[PDB]
From Swiss-Prot:
Gene: WWP2
Provenance organism: Homo sapiens
Residues covered by the WW domain: 1-29
Catalyzed reactions: S-ubiquitinyl-[E2 ubiquitin-conjugating enzyme]-L-cysteine + [acceptor protein]-L-lysine = [E2 ubiquitin-conjugating enzyme]-L-cysteine + N(6)-ubiquitinyl-[acceptor protein]-L-lysine
Further facts: A cysteine residue is required for ubiquitin-thioester formation.
Catalytic site: 409
Protein name (record): NEDD4-like E3 ubiquitin-protein ligase WWP2
Activity control, per UniProt: Activated by NDFIP1- and NDFIP2-binding.
Start and end residues of each HECT domain: 107-436
Length: 436
């Protein structure tokens, strides 16, 4: 069905009989699509809960290492902790409605008080167990297409991003402010979430500029076109672009100027580094400005964003999701060679450097190759990418002088044919460690 009932405040909404849901969004074949693929995952959760509970982080007690950065942050929390507690009541099936009403009617500082959550009806005082389940359950509850808060650029659940069209929910900004408060709470209280935010989403929270590499993790299709513009320098040839980007916003198209007079200004050589930069800048910022500001205002109230300034995108995602034990056997068993084999010296050397690495250095290698620290239920075989499930792959691509290159959307590592164990090691270590 369809329908079109009305609100106490006279706003029109829809009653999807095909789902059994009420939304502000016109319930398309795609909305019904999105909602069912969301549904499944909501029921694939109680079996998965044990997986997510295996997540860990360090025990509270050189320098400029994730671990010090973390224990320093833990301290900043404990120092700003307020006495007494805040008890939130929820029901297993009312988890989102409930948490929203109670945390939005609370002043931000009350939320730094020690948490406790109550599962209505059900016997058992809190302790860590119900907060763990709460944080995880609600981390997914927020992605219900019903609320209009999110969408996915690619295949099924690939590349979580904010729905530019979220403005169709008059409370889109209250909800994105709540998500901000909530994700902040998780970091203040040490608990973990599995929302699915990407490294470039974590960069904004950190006030770090996303790059041309970073679009490969959201729009691999779009990242190539831009790579085509940069690499195929061109003889101008079969190309005519202007400094513009249109955007379909709830049907009506609108042409945005990347710069002033942009519709007028043609893309050319030398000129195109400016444009590539701007386009890249447009892609993360377009349609999601107020949603993202409300997130962040929402986040800042609870745990000041300035407290994360010394983390890079990877350290922060890892602070929110937690660490898993990377089993080297599942990794190796679930790895494919391209222009290489198992016996290639660069492969035998690659596994030798991965054998050295402690778990965090390996997690760091996983984030690099796949765009996240989160290893899925079922491990290295159940590795997913922009084109559905894709296994970890290493390809012989390069010049020896090059640094290894990742393809997070396909989980592929372009590993050049280095001349030595020590060359390859340093290069891999370098690519992974970045500049910390
Ligand atoms: Na991936």
């Amino acid at each position: 069905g369809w329908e079109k009932r009305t609100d106490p405040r006279g706003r029109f909404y829809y009653v999807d009989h095909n789902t059994r849901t009420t939304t502000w969004q016109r319930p398309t074949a795609e909305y019904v699509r999105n909602y069912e693929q969301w549904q499944s995952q909501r029921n694939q959760l109680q079996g998965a809960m044990q997986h997510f509970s295996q997540r860990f982080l360090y025990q509270s007690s050189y320098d400029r290492s994730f671990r010090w950065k973390y224990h320093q942050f833990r301290f900043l929390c404990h120092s700003n902790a307020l006495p007494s507690h805040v008890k939130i009541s929820v029901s297993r099936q009312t988890l989102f409605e409930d948490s929203f009403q109670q945390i939005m009617n609370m002043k931000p500082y009350d939320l730094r008080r020690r948490l406790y959550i109550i599962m209505r009806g059900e016997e058992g005082l809190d302790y860590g167990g119900i907060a763990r389940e709460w944080f995880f359950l609600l981390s997914h509850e927020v992605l219900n297409p019903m609320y209009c808060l999110f969408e996915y650029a690619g295949k099924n659940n690939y590349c979580l991003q904010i729905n530019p069209a979220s403005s169709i929910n008059p409370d889109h900004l209250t909800y994105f402010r709540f998500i901000g408060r909530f994700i902040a709470m998780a970091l203040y209280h040490g608990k973990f979430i599995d929302t699915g935010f990407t490294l470039p989403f974590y960069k904004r929270m950190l006030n770090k500029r996303p790059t041309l590499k970073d679009l490969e993790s959201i729009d691999p299709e779009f990242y190539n076109s831009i790579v085509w513009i940069k690499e195929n320098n061109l003889e101008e040839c079969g190309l005519e672009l202007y400094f513009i980007q249109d955007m379909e916003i709830l049907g009506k198209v609108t042409t945005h100027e990347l710069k002033e007079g942009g519709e007028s200004i043609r893309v050319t050589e030398e000129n195109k580094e400016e444009y590539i930069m701007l386009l890249t800048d447009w892609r993360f910022t377009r349609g999601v400005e107020e949603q993202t500001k409300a997130f962040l205002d929402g986040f800042n109230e609870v745990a000041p964003l300035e407290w994360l300034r010394y983390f890079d995108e990877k350290e922060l995602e890892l602070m929110l999701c937690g660490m898993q034990e990377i089993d080297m056997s599942d990794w190796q068993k679930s790895t494919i060679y391209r222009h290489y084999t198992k016996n290639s010296k660069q492969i035998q050397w690659f596994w030798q450097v991965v054998k050295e690495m402690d778990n965090e250095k390996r997690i760091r290698l996983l984030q690099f190759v796949t765009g996240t620290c989160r290893l899925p239920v079922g491990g290295f075989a159940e590795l997913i990418g922009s084109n559905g499930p894709q296994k970890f792959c290493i390809d012989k691509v390069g010049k020896e002088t090059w640094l290894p290159r990742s393809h997070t959307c396909f989980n592929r590592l372009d590993l050049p044919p280095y001349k030595s164990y020590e060359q390859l090691r340093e290069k891999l270590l370098y690519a992974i460690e970045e500049t910390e």
